[PDB]
Structure formats: C-alpha cells, structure tokens
Design a protein around this ligand. Structure first.
Ligand code: SF4
Ligand code: SF4
Ligand code: SF4
Ligand code: SF4
Ligand code: FES
Length: 574
C-alpha cells in the first residue's frame, strides 16, 4: 500500500502508475495537452499537466510516477500560474479566431484557454495566411497558424504507421511540422491515412475540402447528384451531434441527405457487396490456378500507397477488384444511367467516407472512363456533419428513412467492411459458397475479428486448407513483413487496413477527446454497430444482395469476366 495524499485526500494504492493516470482513475482533475498515445512531447513538453509534489516542486503529472509518501497539490496558485503561463505562450503563436474555425465545437485548446482564463501577451494576428497554409495535398491540409507544436501528430504517425512521414522540420530557424523536406505529403512516403489529423488537438491538421465540389454540383441544375456513405459513417457521425458513442444513425443520415438536396441516396455498402463479388471470384480463380499467392486486398488506399512506396513487388498480388468506392462510382456512370435515362455526363457522384486517403484514390488520373470520373467528390464524416449543421438540420431528432434500393441495398457482409477483418469475413462467406457450389449456413468467422494487430485463420475451402491473415494497421504490415511472419506458412489471402481498427478509426472520423478515449474503446464501440447490422440483416452474403443480383444479371453479367472484368477492375503498375 503506497500512501499518497492528493489535495489533502489520502489514497492507499498498490498501483505503479503516473500521477496523471491515477488522478484520472480517481476523479481528480488534472489537465493535459501533449500527452497522447502513451507519450508526451518529449522535447518541448507542454507542461499543462503540471502539479506540485511537496518536497520536490512542480512536476509534469503525465510522466511522473506516484510514490509512497507523496503529497501532491494539483490546484495551487503556483501550479495554476505555471499552466496559465504555458497556455498564454501558446496563444502568442495561435490565431485565436474560433468563429469560422473547423474545430470550434470540439477544440482541446479552446477548452484550456477557458479553463485557465489564459491571455496572450501579444495576440497573434497574421495577416497573410498563405505562408502558414499547405493545401497542396489531395487529402491533407496544414494550417500552421493553429499549430501548438505539441508533437501529437508526429508521434501518432510513428506509432500507427511507422513511416514517420510527419516530421519536425527546421524552416528558416523556426520549428514547424510537415512532410519530408516540406514537400507536398502526396509526393512523399505518406499514406494519406490522416491519423495525424485524428491526433491533433486543434484545427492545424485537416482534410482537403471537397465541400465546394459538392456545393457547386448541388447548385448546378443539370447535375444529378448521387450520394453514398461508407460503412463506418453510420456508426460514428452521431458523435458530432451529441448522441454519444456506438449509436446507429443510418436512417437519420438518409433523411439528412435528402434534406440537403441530393437526388439519389445510395450506399457504399452496395459497392462493398460488388467488391466481394469480384474479389471472391478472383480468389476462387487463384485457388483453381494454384496462385499466385498471396492475394492481398486492394480496397484501402493507405495500404495501396504503402505497397507502392515500400513493397512495389507486391502490387501484382493485389486484388484487381476496384474498392467499394471506385467500383460503385464506375457503376454509377454506366449501370445507373441504364436504369434511369440519365445522361452519364450529368451524373455527379459523391461519397461520404471516414477517410482522407479516399480523396486521393478518387482523384487518381486513371479512375475514370470515357472522360467520366468514377467518383467526383469525397467528403469525410466531419465534412458531412458540418454540412448538416450549416443547413440547420436537427439531426438528432430526424425520422428514419431508407436508401434508394437499386444501388442502396446491402448485405451484412458488406455492412461489416468498416471493421478490421470485415473484408476478410465478407469475402470468405462468398468464396466458400462459390468454390464449393454450396449455400453454407455457417458464415461467422470470428477468428478474423477484433483488435489484435495481426490475425490469422485456417479455412477449409472445398476440402483443402488455406491460410488467411488480417493486418490491422500500417505499422502491423511492416511488422508482418519485416519479422518474416509472412513466411511461417503459405498465406493465400491477406486483408490489409492502414488504420488500426479498420475504417471505423479512419482519418476522416470525428475527433475524440483524449479523456473519452481513456474511457471508451472507440474502435470496438464503432465496430459494434456494424456487426449488429450484420446480425439483423436478412441477407448476410454479398452475392445474395437482390439489387446487386439484378444489376449483374441485367447489366454486368458474371463477375470476373465480360463487362465486369473490363470496367470494374484496376491494377497498379507502380
Ligand atoms: S484551433 Fe481551437 S482555439 Fe484555435 S481558433 Fe480553432 S477553435 Fe479556437
Ligand atoms: S497521413 Fe498517415 S502516413 Fe501521412 S503523415 Fe499523417 S499519419 Fe503519417
Ligand atoms: S499539427 Fe496538431 S498535433 Fe501536430 S504539432 Fe501541430 S497542434 Fe500538435
Ligand atoms: S483503413 Fe479505411 S479509413 Fe484507414 S486509410 Fe484505409 S480505407 Fe481509409
Ligand atoms: S501533457 Fe504532460 S507535458 Fe504535455
């Protein structure tokens, strides 16, 4: 029993832990800023977690271990004035104009300024932002008038991806963050996964806006504007409307989209089922052809960039199926006209994604046919929330509506795509029926679910054994390759997601404050929505999607051949 005193209350504990963590454990208020992902900003520590230890002085609670005999005061005048001082110093480098700011409603810094009634010694009022802003990327943007130089993005990049594509740079004698050599991120090894954005406490890192593309298309009378959301959006956007965590808001989204004026409400889960039709078919062909193995998924553009940038020799092993977004988009410019009378050139296709890398994918030059882009705009979950709020739509009390079914129906296999191992599970449900010419009732592959960084399973397909792996996060791809794990056995099919937890933890998702992250397992809670959908859907195999089956039978023919192979696939040369 360590005996410690905090603010004159006695605690007895066997724990070995920091002052911050014990304080959070025991409902004692200590502020923190740079501490995230189980670090601090090791050079240039923020000191916002300052406390007083009697007999020692002011210490940073986030990395100071409790010890027997400790007497700690978290709220003395000397403590508070130190913290207020540090915040004041940050205000001197911060353009404090919250009105038009994209983090106005959930900013960690604003909360601290209010809490400590901090004041700049000199307001920072840059009158040329162009010098502080980098909007070159198709996916990320930087506004250094907001940057606290807290290093959370640098550490998050390193931990989540191990690319270290986000760096501290010396620019003109001054420290900034940015890409290697202050290049555009896209021109570096960066995956464009946005985990750096998710780690940022302020509006310094953001997604590259596609809001003007959307606005202009909705305002163009001749454009017919389709919208379709990713699996994960329905499991997360409610967080930005005060509804809490793990709330299924699918039906409210469809209603909001109609109120925003979109012409057709479809769903990327339909594209997920399409990807499975193509990719399960391809896997069966590879089985019949004795390879080449392994086949890797190709639906995560962060992973595609990782392969391009670090494992180009694996590109010909990637599934040729387009991702759900791009396969959907392709069909929206071909099949959808065929059942509507729309001129394909007037269809404008918008997706809503939990992802920043999806904007790069959509903008890839060859992701088009007959001069028509597969996908014309990609907005993140955050961008859609802003749109809904700007339109004054009372989201939390909307009535549910349904999608337009022709490219809107989805199976429970497509529904689970947004969680790590979801693609794998979905794919196996169709590949085993396909390979065995059977309709199997046993379809749950729990072995590939959950938050382990690398997962594996042995699957029997048509009386032979196959090995599959699920790589959960870009850093785990590096581990899997570098460790040689990939050689313990012949792998046949491998899912890779760049974001840990899969797309539910993508870089376009709602920010979560670090204290909530401490009490809510965001990856699991968001994923649970998706798995619950699967449990209640009447179709749980992609090839049982009735609108999809109609689409292949009337328009595309059989997967992996004919029209489908010719326009629903994409291969990477580099
Ligand atoms: S980053 Fe935060 S404190 Fe700074 S202007 Fe935006 S909302 Fe205000
Ligand atoms: S987008 Fe991903 S890889 Fe690039 S700097 Fe951010 S966290 Fe690192
Ligand atoms: S961009 Fe954001 S996370 Fe990175 S150092 Fe600046 S304030 Fe911190
Ligand atoms: S895991 Fe999903 S959100 Fe993350 S980069 Fe890949 S596609 Fe995007
Ligand atoms: S939160 Fe402890 S030094 Fe930054």
């Amino acid at each position: 029993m360590k005996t410690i005193i905090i603010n004159g209350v006695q605690f007895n504990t066997d724990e070995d832990t920091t002052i911050l963590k014990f304080a959070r454990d025991n409902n004692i208020d200590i502020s923190a800023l740079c501490f995230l992902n189980n670090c601090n900003n090791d050079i240039n520590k923020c000191e916002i977690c300052t406390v007083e230890v009697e007999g020692t002085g002011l210490v940073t609670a986030c990395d100071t271990l409790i010890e027997d005999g400790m007497i700690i005061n978290t709220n003395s005048d000397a403590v508070n004035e130190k913290i207020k001082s540090r915040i004041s110093q940050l205000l001197d480098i911060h353009e404090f104009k919250c009105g038009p700011c994209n983090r106005r409603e959930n900013c960690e810094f604003l909360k601290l300024v209010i809490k400590y009634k901090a004041r700049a010694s000199k307001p920072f009022l840059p009158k040329d932002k162009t010098e502080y802003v980098d909007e070159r990327s198709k996916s990320l943007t930087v506004d250094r008038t907001k940057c606290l130089l807290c290093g959370r993005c640098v550490n998050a990049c390193g931990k989540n991806t191990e690319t270290y594509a986000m760096k501290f740079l010396n620019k003109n004698g001054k420290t900034i963050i940015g890409a290697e050599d202050e290049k555009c991120f896209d021109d570096t090894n960066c995956l464009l996964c946005g985990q750096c954005i998710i780690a940022c406490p302020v509006a310094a890192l953001s997604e590259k806006s596609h809001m003007d593309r959307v606005k202009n298309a909705l305002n163009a009378p001749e454009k017919h504007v389709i919208v379709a959301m990713a699996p994960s959006v329905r499991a997360s956007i409610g967080e930005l409307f005060n509804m809490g965590f793990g709330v299924d808001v699918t039906g409210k989204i469809y209603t909001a989209l109609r109120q925003l004026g979109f012409d057709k409400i479809f769903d990327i889960n339909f594209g997920a089922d399409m990807t499975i039709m193509e990719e399960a078919t391809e896997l069966v062909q590879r089985i019949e052809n004795n390879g080449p193995f392994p086949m890797f998924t190709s639906c995560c553009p962060g992973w595609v960039r990782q392969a391009e940038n670090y494992y180009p020799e694996l590109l010909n092993n990637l599934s040729s199926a387009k991702s759900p977004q791009q396969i959907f988009g392709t069909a929206s410019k071909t099949y959808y006209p065929s059942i509507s009378g729309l001129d394909p050139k007037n269809v404008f296709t918008v997706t809503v994604m939990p992802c920043t890398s999806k904007k790069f994918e959509a903008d890839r030059p060859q992701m088009e046919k007959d001069g028509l882009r597969d996908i014309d705009a990609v907005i993140t979950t955050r961008e859609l929330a802003k749109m809904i709020k700007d339109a004054k739509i009372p989201f939390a009390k909307l009535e549910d509506s349904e999608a337009d079914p022709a490219m809107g129906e989805y199976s429970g296999a497509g529904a689970i795509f947004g969680a790590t191992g979801g693609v794998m599970e979905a794919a196996l449900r169709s590949a085993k029926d396909f390979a065995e010419n059977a309709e199997l009732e046993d379809i749950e592959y729990k072995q590939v679910r959950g938050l382990n960084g690398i997962k594996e399973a042995e699957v029997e397909i048509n009386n032979n054994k196959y090995n599959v792996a699920v790589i959960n996060g870009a850093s785990n791809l590096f581990k899997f390759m570098k460790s040689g794990m990939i050689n313990e056995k012949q792998y046949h099919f491998i899912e890779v997601m760049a974001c840990h937890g899969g797309c539910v933890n993508g870089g376009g998702q709602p920010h979560v404050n670090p204290k909530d992250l401490e009490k809510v397992d965001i990856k699991k809670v968001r994923a649970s929505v998706l798995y619950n959908q699967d449990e209640h859907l009447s179709k749980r195999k992609s090839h049982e999607n009735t609108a999809l089956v109609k689409m292949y039978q009337n328009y595309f023919g059989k997967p992996g051949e004919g029209r489908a192979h010719e326009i629903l696939h994409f291969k990477y040369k580099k």
